[PDB]
Curated annotation (Swiss-Prot), chain B:
UniProtKB keywords: Cell cycle, Cell division, Cell shape, Cell wall biogenesis/degradation, Magnesium, Metal-binding, Peptidoglycan synthesis, Transferase
Matches recorded under NCBIfam families: PRK10240.1, PRK14830.1, uppS
Annotated family: Belongs to the UPP synthase family.
Name this polypeptide is given: Ditrans,polycis-undecaprenyl-diphosphate synthase ((2E,6E)-farnesyl-diphosphate specific)
Gene behind the chain: ispU
Source species of the chain: Escherichia coli (strain K12)
Length: 207, 208
C-alpha cells in the first residue's frame, strides 16, 4: 500500500573510510546502490521514488537517462538548479522533457534541494500573486500552498528512509512529510540492498 | 551538559495504556496528565529552556494547573489555532499567558488545535498581508524571513523531538521547526514515560 518512498541516502563517506578507501570510491559504490534501489522500486510497483544525496552528481545521471527512458521511468530533478551552468540546466530540461510522458516509476532526484527552500519558493509565488492583486491574504490555505510545493501532482509521501545512522530529516522534505512513516537504519547507503528496502516497506505495512 | 535547549514531545499512548489494564479512556488521560506534570518538573530541573507538548476539554479544566505552573516559575504559552475557540476559553488562555509571561524558568508551550502545516500557513498570511499593504516585496521573502513568522520563532530552535507510544511519524506536529532536530521514538506509552526515560532521550541527543 506504499505509493511514494523518499530516501535520504547517507553514509557514502563513512563507507569509503571503513573500506580504507578515498571519498570517490564511496561515491561510485553509492551510484551502484542508486541503480539497485531504482530497479527494486520499479519492479515492485512503487509509483514514485524521491532520492536525496546528503552539479557533479547530476552530471553522472546524464549518461543513465537513455536507459531510464527505455524502462518507462519519468525523471524529475527537484531543488534550486537556477545557479547551475546553463549547459547543465538545458541537459536537465531535455531529460525531463524526454521522459515526461512516461507512465512507470516517477524518479525525483533532489539537486540542491532544501525543504525550507521548497516552501519559500512556493510562498514567493503566492506573494507575486498577492502583489499582482490576483489573490487575497485571507484566501491562502493549506490546499493552496500545497499546490505550489514540489511533487504536489504525485501520490503523498508514504515512507521516508534514512540510511547511515543519523536520526534527522536534515531539511529534506518538510511540508510533504506531515503523515509519512519515518524509518531510520544504521546500514550505510552503499550497502543498502533489496532486503533492507523490503524491511522498510514492512515497517510501513505494520503501521 | 546534555545540550538541549528545546525539547518537543508527541505524547501518544494514553488510550493504549488504559486498554492494557481494562480501563476506559479517561483513566489513561489522567495517568497521561500525571506524566505531563512529571515531564514538566523534570524539564524545569534539568535546565531545559523550552518544552513543547502535543497531546495526540483538555485545555479547559487545565486552567486548573496554571496556578501550580506559576508557582514553579514556568512561563506558559498556547500554540495553535484557538481563534474559533469558545468565548473566554480565549480570555482564560490570554490571562493564563499574561499571568505567567514574567516567569523566568521553563517556557512551556502547549499545542491546542495545532498543525505544522497550519503554522506555516498563518506565517505565510502575515507575509501576504505585508505584501498587500505594499510594505514587503515578494523577492525579499527568504527562509530567515518566514522563520520569523512561524510559532515559537523567538525561542531556541527545537533540538530534539520525542514521540512515545511506538508510532514513527510527525503526524503534522512541528514541520518547519524540525528541519534539523534529533528525532527520538520510544515504544514506551506516554503514561509510563518517566524521568529516566527523559534522561535517556537527552543522553541520546548528547551522544548523537
Ligand atoms: C550517482 C548517479 C546514479 C545514477 C543512477 C541513475 C538511476 C539509474 O537506475 C537505473 C535503473 C535501471 C536501469 C535499467 O534497468 C536499464 C535498462 O533496463 C536498459 O538499458 O535497457 C538503468 C538505470
Ligand atoms: C491536564 C493536562 C496535564 C496537566 C498538567 C499541566 C501542567 C502542569 O505542570 C505541572 C508541573 C508540576 C506541578 C507540580 O509541582 C504539582 C504538585 O506538586 C501536585 O500536583 O501536587 C504541577 C503542574
Amino acid at each position: 500500500g506504499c505509493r511514494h518512498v523518499a530516501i535520504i541516502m547517507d553514509g557514502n563517506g563513512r563507507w569509503a573510510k571503513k573500506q580504507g578507501k578515498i571519498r570517490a570510491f564511496g561515491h561510485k559504490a553509492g551510484a551502484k546502490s542508486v541503480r539497485r534501489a531504482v530497479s527494486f522500486a520499479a519492479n515492485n510497483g512503487i509509483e514514485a521514488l524521491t532520492l536525496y544525496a546528503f552539479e557533479l552528481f547530476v552530471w553522472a545521471l546524464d549518461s543513465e537517462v537513455k536507459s531510464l527512458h527505455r524502462h518507462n521511468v519519468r525523471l524529475r530533478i527537484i531543488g534550486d538548479t537556477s545557479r547551475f551552468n546553463s549547459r547543465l540546466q538545458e541537459r536537465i530540461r531535455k531529460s525531463e522533457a524526454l521522459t515526461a510522458g512516461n507512465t512507470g516509476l516517477t524518479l525525483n532526484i533532489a539537486a540542491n534541494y532544501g525543504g525550507r527552500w521548497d516552501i519559500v519558493q512556493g510562498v514567493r509565488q503566492l506573494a507575486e500573486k498577492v502583489q499582482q492583486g490576483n489573490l487575497q491574504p485571507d484566501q491562502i490555505d493549506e490546499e493552496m500552498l500545497n499546490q505550489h510545493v514540489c511533487m504536489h501532482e504525485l501520490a503523498p509521501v508514504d515512507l521516508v528512509i534514512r540510511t547511515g545512522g543519523e536520526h534527522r530529516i536534515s531539511n529534506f522534505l518538510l511540508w510533504q512529510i506531515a503523515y509519512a512513516e519515518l524509518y531510520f537504519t544504521d546500514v550505510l547507503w552503499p550497502d543498502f540492498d533489496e532486503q533492507d528496502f523490503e524491511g522498510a516497506l514492512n515497517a510501513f505495512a505494520n503501521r
